Amino acid sequence: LDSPSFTEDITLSAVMLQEEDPGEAATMSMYPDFLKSFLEHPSSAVFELIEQYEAT
């Protein structure tokens, strides 16, 4: 119970500021999220899958 929207974002932005390349690490972090989104969506829901890739 109760309220995520401001403290987690500050911690993640502060962790990526310690990486030698925050752009490459942002790209790398999305690899499991893309596969997970593919596995969660049945082959009938292909457009909900693309909307989830856009959101990611």
Among the listed ranges 2-10, 13-21, 22-30, the one in contact with another protein (CB under 8 A) is 22-30
| Residue 34 near residue 56, CB atoms below 8 Å | yes
| Residue 55 near residue 33, CB atoms below 8 Å | no
Residue with structure tokens 């596995």?
Answer: 39
Does position 50 interact with another protein (CB under 8 A)? The reply is: yes
Does position 53 interact with another protein (CB under 8 A)? The reply is: yes
Among the listed ranges 3-11, 13-21, 24-32, the one in contact with another protein (CB under 8 A) is 24-32
24 to each of 1, 16, 21, how far by Cα in Å? 34, 10, 6
What residue ranges bind another protein (CB under 8 A)?
24, 27-28, 30-31, 34, 38, 42-46, 49-50, 53
